[PDB]
Design a protein around this ligand. Structure first.
Ligand code: K
Ligand code: K
Ligand code: K
Ligand code: K
Ligand code: K
Ligand code: K
Ligand code: K
Ligand code: K
Ligand code: K
Ligand code: K
Ligand code: MG
Ligand code: MG
Ligand code: MG
Ligand code: MG
Ligand code: MG
Ligand code: MG
Ligand code: MG
Ligand code: MG
Ligand code: MG
Ligand code: MG
Ligand code: MG
Ligand code: MG
Ligand code: MG
Ligand code: MG
Ligand code: MG
Ligand code: MG
Ligand code: MG
Ligand code: MG
Lengths: 153, 84, 129, 206, 100, 99
RNA sequence: ACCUGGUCUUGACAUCCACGGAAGUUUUCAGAGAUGAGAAUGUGCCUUCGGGAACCGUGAGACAGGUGCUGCAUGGCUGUCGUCAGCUCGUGUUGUGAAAUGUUGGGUUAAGUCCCGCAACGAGCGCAACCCUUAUCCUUUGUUGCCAGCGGUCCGGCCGGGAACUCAAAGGAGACUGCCAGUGAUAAACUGGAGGAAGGUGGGGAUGACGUCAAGUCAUCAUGGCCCUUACGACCAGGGCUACACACGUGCUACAAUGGCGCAUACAAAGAGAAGCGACCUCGCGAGAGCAAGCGGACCUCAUAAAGUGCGUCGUAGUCCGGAUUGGAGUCUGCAACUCGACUCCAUGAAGUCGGAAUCGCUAGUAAUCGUGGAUCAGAAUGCCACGGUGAAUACGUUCCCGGGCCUU
């Protein structure tokens, strides 16, 4: 906004693990305010991921987030003349938000049976650097690299 | 439709008219404005001129018309198509 | 730690009466167990939070009656009432409870519907022509 | 833009209601209609009596009408003859025993309804509207109102194009709820049509 | 509203009041479950003989000061415009501008 | 025992009526329970303020009916007759029950 | 308020005059009704029993009547820029004058908010505050509302009780940059901290300045002028306002598995009710029906909240998705459901598999989603107004789009 008067809102940690990171992931996945449904989906997918891999749910989730998190994005900047796509560094909070949003969108786009299964498959693919939201991170990085010459506007 | 426990509806004036017409050989059309009257199995054979809003159209009552209202056979709106 | 201590909690349209006394850790809400009443893990955590913070979970017995609102509102009202009961029990926990943010009464209520709007703020769809 | 009614916005704060009775839904509309008819008859009958306010109460199976007037002698008549006649007619209209009380409006120049009616009578008598409004404002200010505003709208002076003209003195703080604002309107039916008059009078904050 | 339109309503109210019970007992006979199959027919035929204006369903609530057939309010017996005018003038007991 | 139910559009008026009722009941020997403030009824109305169209321009009004309950337990003979002649102020509805 | 047809002319709705008559009730015929022709029953009530004085009918004529025209003759009421921070006046002073100053400037604020400066000194309408509601606490009162300590108990606050608690509603307290630190022109003020339920306008509402659009409304009402008067007035029946090659706006329901279906099982708020809400019981697959409590209500009824959770099944299919359309059979309201009502049952099972250009709403208990109530109302909501449940994402910033404010050119 113009006035710069927006603070921050505290978020309760998730029940099973007490991680605000996972609580934010549940919030992103939630639709129509059905938080219990979102939590059940997330927990089922996390248990499937944990039994697929050798790490805990939090460790596997962190691996997937590390593989999907972007570092530099492109934003439009209009100056005297034409608008340029300037590459800008992404702050850590936005890195996490983008990683979660891309993962959720990719899982929703997948075509498996259940949403929990789709989320588990997407998380495993992210941990192995395959599939969507990983291609999305790659596309964002490619655009930033192509527009690197404009990193002074 | 009308509840069974109340029986089919019929206007009293039309009932009197059909009673006076059935016993006699009167084949003249029975002019009426009562489109709400149910067709009863007692006036099959004679013609009833039902009002449609601006004139009386004659319907020849047959057996298959029993249970319908008189207005069902007197359309009220004139339509011939757009640009036809 | 010899007599009953009372607390009142409120959240949304929920009001909760909380009675606390020394015990072993049994919680009754509306003549039911905590797990019987609150099937939501979030609600269970909200109910348990002050006790976990003060490390007195198994030193007390909880007798709670609630009315109004829904699951989350009742859980939050219970948490507020438990915080007030603990403050009545011991007055040295006020600082830590306020630091955790449990002393504050959450005043967020449902915004009224207003003329010309579909909801509190959602306006009907606009069209220039 | 449009403004809220100054009396209505203050009806529960500094201003009293003009009807004080209780009823259920069964007789609420009937009571409202009877009050309307009573006020209509009284206003028509006491046209020259300078009636400013008609308060109606229904204690129990009876009607009590208080008439605030600047000419109580004209209202009452000789040994209560006119007020007795009005009591009879009011009882007949309302269908219940009637009791009429007379209240004194001292300083009619400080009463919004009376000022508006006076301006309206002058306009119907073809007095200059500017002179009428200036006189009303000056009289109220001299009597000691903290403020007054007078507004006249219509075909002033028989002009083909209608317009609105207003004068104000002192302060008339219409946004202050606790301000004592007496507001009233009147209509004049001249040969060129209807002219509307509105009068606000400020009497200090409570 | 027009004077004739108001007269129609007063006439309808008068007719309904006059024929109130003579309609009620006929309707009771018609709706009687244990009634015969010919007294029901006679009652049905007789109900049509009464003037149509005697049915209470023919009445339309109107503003008691103007005759407006739309925007009626039963609690006050007036249309919305007249209710607003009376409320602002302070003539409706206990009624003020609401806010919550 | 007798029940007094008081209805009013003005809570100050209802408070005056209840105060005078309890005074005139306690003076005449019989004791009084209350007065009890029953939940206020809030009837609401919404009207269009323009004579024509402008559907979103409305006025919202309300009527507040305040309710009071008075218990008279063990009413004496001089208590009973000291009630209807009190002639409470206008705008207060009084209902008497023999409970 | 429109059309066709059938009818009336001081008249459907008022006042005045003359005459006949109590008003009213009960039936017959014709019409399709308006209406006409009758046929019986009453003939009351003050009354100096001269008269009346209600209410009817007839007779004329002053008149009634008009939702007929002009919102570009008007009042009243409303939209709108815009809840934007603006708009002005008196006296003084400047200029031949239109005008200017004040109201500009340095800061600051949500604010023409406040401080400082200053040929201005003051004032008014606007801002803010006073109003309602919501968040905390105290006192009083305690039934129809409540149950902590007790005593019983059919385990149902059910009973004796209790006045603690939730709560109901009256009166008070509380928030004021009040305190601390830093910055700032020794100012206004800003940033942060303490205490507190709430911190900087705490949240929401009401409140709409001078004016603008000859903006809307002569069909709520009122009103100048004009127009009709055996008709543009009045009554009635039937029809129409519900039409249908098409185009647009606002919504509802979906296209499914974060779901459908079946069973079981929790947790709300607000409101209405007497020609009304209508329980229990019985009948019906059901909409409902019969009988019949209670309630003008913190008591009774509407009235089971739903989403939610547990278990089972469906397994990606135009499907156990979707429920449009149509056939048959019914219910209820209502003189009367054909044109043209709502709801129920059986069957039928359309388009639709996420929507081009383009475009809309929303900054937090909001959006989204889920149910509930009310006015209108005999019956007839996917609209409108209102109420709770669950409950997000994001805001780096003001270059750009739209609207606006101040100074300057
Ligand atoms: K106008
Ligand atoms: K010059
Ligand atoms: K000057
Ligand atoms: K006119
Ligand atoms: K029709
Ligand atoms: K719709
Ligand atoms: K649409
Ligand atoms: K199907
Ligand atoms: K129909
Ligand atoms: K400019
Ligand atoms: Mg809601
Ligand atoms: Mg529009
Ligand atoms: Mg008229
Ligand atoms: Mg109707
Ligand atoms: Mg105009
Ligand atoms: Mg200016
Ligand atoms: Mg200037
Ligand atoms: Mg100011
Ligand atoms: Mg200055
Ligand atoms: Mg203000
Ligand atoms: Mg125009
Ligand atoms: Mg127009
Ligand atoms: Mg008709
Ligand atoms: Mg239409
Ligand atoms: Mg299906
Ligand atoms: Mg905003
Ligand atoms: Mg209805
Ligand atoms: Mg400014």
């Amino acid at each position: 906004p113009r006035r710069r008067v927006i603070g921050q809102r505290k978020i309760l940690p998730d029940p099973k693990f007490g991680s605000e990171l996972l609580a934010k992931f549940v919030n992103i996945l939630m639709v129509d305010g059905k938080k219990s449904t979102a939590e059940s989906i997330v927990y089922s997918a996390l248990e499937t991921l944990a039994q697929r891999s050798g790490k805990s749910e939090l460790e596997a989730f962190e691996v997937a987030l590390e593989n999907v998190r972007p570092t530099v994005e492109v934003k439009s900047r209009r100056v005297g003349g034409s608008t340029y796509q300037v590459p800008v560094e992404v702050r850590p909070v936005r890195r996490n938000a983008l990683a979660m949003r891309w993962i959720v969108e990719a899982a929703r786009k997948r075509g498996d049976k259940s949403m929990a299964l789709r989320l588990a498959n997407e998380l495993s693919d992210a941990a192995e650097n395959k599939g969507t939201a990983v291609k999305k991170r790659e596309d964002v990085h490619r655009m930033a690299e192509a527009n690197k010459a404009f990193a002074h506007y | 439709p009308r509840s069974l426990k109340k029986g089919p509806f019929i206007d009293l004036h039309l009932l009197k008219k059909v009673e006076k017409a059935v016993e006699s050989g009167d084949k003249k059309p029975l002019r009426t404005w009562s489109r709400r009257s149910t067709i009863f199995p007692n006036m099959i054979g004679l013609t009833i001129a039902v009002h449609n809003g601006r004139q009386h159209v004659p319907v020849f009552v047959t057996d298959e018309m029993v249970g319908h209202k008189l207005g069902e056979f007197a359309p009220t709106r004139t339509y011939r198509g757009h640009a036809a | 730690a010899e007599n009953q201590y009372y607390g009142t909690g409120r959240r949304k349209s929920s009001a909760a009466r909380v009675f606390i006394k020394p015990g072993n850790g049994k919680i009754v809400i509306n003549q039911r167990s905590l797990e019987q009443y609150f099937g939501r893990e979030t609600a269970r955590m909200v109910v348990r939070q002050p006790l976990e913070l003060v490390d007195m979970v198994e030193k007390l017995d909880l007798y709670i009656t609630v009315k109004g609102g829904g699951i989350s509102g009742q859980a939050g009202a219970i948490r507020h009432g438990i915080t007030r009961a603990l403050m009545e029990y011991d007055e040295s926990l006020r600082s830590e409870l306020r630091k955790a943010g449990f002393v504050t009464r959450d005043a967020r209520q449902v915004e009224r519907k207003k003329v010309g709007l579909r909801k509190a703020r959602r306006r009907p769809q606009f069209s220039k022509r | 833009g449009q403004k809220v009614h100054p009396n209505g916005i203050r009806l529960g704060i500094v201003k009293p209601w003009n009807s004080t009775w209780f009823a259920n839904t069964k007789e609420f509309a009937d009571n409202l209609d009877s009050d309307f008819k009573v006020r209509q008859y009284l206003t028509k009958e006491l046209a020259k009596a300078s009636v400013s306010r008609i308060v109606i109460e229904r204690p129990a199976k009876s009607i009590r009408v208080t008439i605030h007037t600047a000419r109580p002698g004209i209202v009452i008549g000789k040994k209560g003859e006119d007020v007795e006649k009005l009591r009879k007619v009011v009882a007949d209209i309302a269908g219940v025993p009637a009791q009429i009380n007379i209240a004194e409006v001292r300083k009619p120049e400080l009463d919004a309804k009376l000022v508006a009616d006076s301006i309206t009578s002058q306009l119907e008598r073809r007095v200059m509207f500017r002179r009428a409004m200036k006189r009303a404002v000056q009289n109220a200010m001299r009597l000691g109102a903290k403020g007054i505003k007078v507004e006249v709208s219509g075909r002033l002076g028989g002009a083909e194009i209608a317009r609105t003209e207003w004068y104000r003195e002192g302060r008339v703080p219409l946004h202050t709820l606790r301000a004592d604002i007496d507001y009233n309107t009147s209509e004049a039916h001249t040969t060129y049509g209807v002219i509307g008059v509105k009068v606000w009078i400020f009497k200090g904050e409570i | 509203a027009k004077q004739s339109m108001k007269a129609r309503e007063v006439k309808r109210v008068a007719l309904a009041d006059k024929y109130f019970a003579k309609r009620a007992e006929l309707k009771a006979i018609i709706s009687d479950v244990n009634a015969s199959d010919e007294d029901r027919w006679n009652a049905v035929l007789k109900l049509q003989t009464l003037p149509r204006d005697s049915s209470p369903s023919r009445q339309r609530n109107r503003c008691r000061q103007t005759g407006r057939p739309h925007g009626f309010l039963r609690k006050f017996g007036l249309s919305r415009i007249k209710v607003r005018e009376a409320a602002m003038r302070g003539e409706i007991p206990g009624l003020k501008k609401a806010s919550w | 025992r007798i029940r007094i139910r008081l209805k009013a559009f003005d809570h100050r008026l209802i408070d005056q009526a209840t105060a005078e009722i309890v005074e005139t009941a306690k003076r005449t020997g019989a004791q009084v329970r209350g007065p009890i403030p029953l939940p206020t009824r809030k009837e609401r109305f919404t009207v269009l303020i323009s004579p024509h169209v402008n559907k979103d321009a409305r006025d919202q009004y309300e009527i507040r009916t305040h309710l009071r309950l008075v218990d008279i337990v063990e009413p004496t003979e001089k208590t009973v007759d000291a009630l209807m002649r009190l002639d409470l102020a206008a705008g207060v509805d009084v209902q008497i029950s023999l409970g």
